[PDB]
Amino acid sequence: FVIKGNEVSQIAPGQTGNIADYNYKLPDDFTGCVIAWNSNKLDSKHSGN
Amino acid sequence: YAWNRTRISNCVADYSVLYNFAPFFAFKCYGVSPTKLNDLCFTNVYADS
């Protein structure tokens, strides 16, 4: 998925915010990796994506 | 150096409104989890600003 920077920190197994709470929820005992890449050069558009 | 203290009492709290006032740099709780403050807010409550 594509998430905005101020909500990347909301992706932890346990955390609050509109993403952690309503869009993507991880188990609190989850095993795995959340790997992030800056895609500004690909996803942003002058008129807005 | 002269921080302000606001006394909060005789109210019904509701802490989801605190996510509307501003995006946060940090929201770190000690002795209580961020997800449960709607309940468990009791006794003297003070806002150090």
Swiss-Prot record, chain B:
Attaches the virion to the cell membrane by interacting with host receptor, initiating the infection. The major receptor is host ACE2. When S2/S2' has been cleaved, binding to the receptor triggers direct fusion at the cell membrane. When S2/S2' has not been cleaved, binding to the receptor results in internalization of the virus by endocytosis using host TFRC and GRM2 and leading to fusion of the virion membrane with the host endosomal membrane. Alternatively, may use NRP1/NRP2 and integrin as entry receptors. Binds to host ACE2. RBD also interacts with the N-linked glycan on 'Asn-90' of ACE2. Cleavage of S generates a polybasic C-terminal sequence on S1 that binds to host Neuropilin-1 (NRP1) and Neuropilin-2 (NRP2) receptors. Interacts with host integrin alpha-5/beta-1 (ITGA5:ITGB1) and with ACE2 in complex with integrin alpha-5/beta-1 (ITGA5:ITGB1). May interact via cytoplasmic c-terminus with M protein. May interact (via N-terminus) with host bilirubin and biliverdin, thereby preventing antibody binding to the SARS-CoV-2 spike NTD via an allosteric mechanism. This is Spike protein S1. The chain holds residues 351 to 399 of 1273 of the full protein.
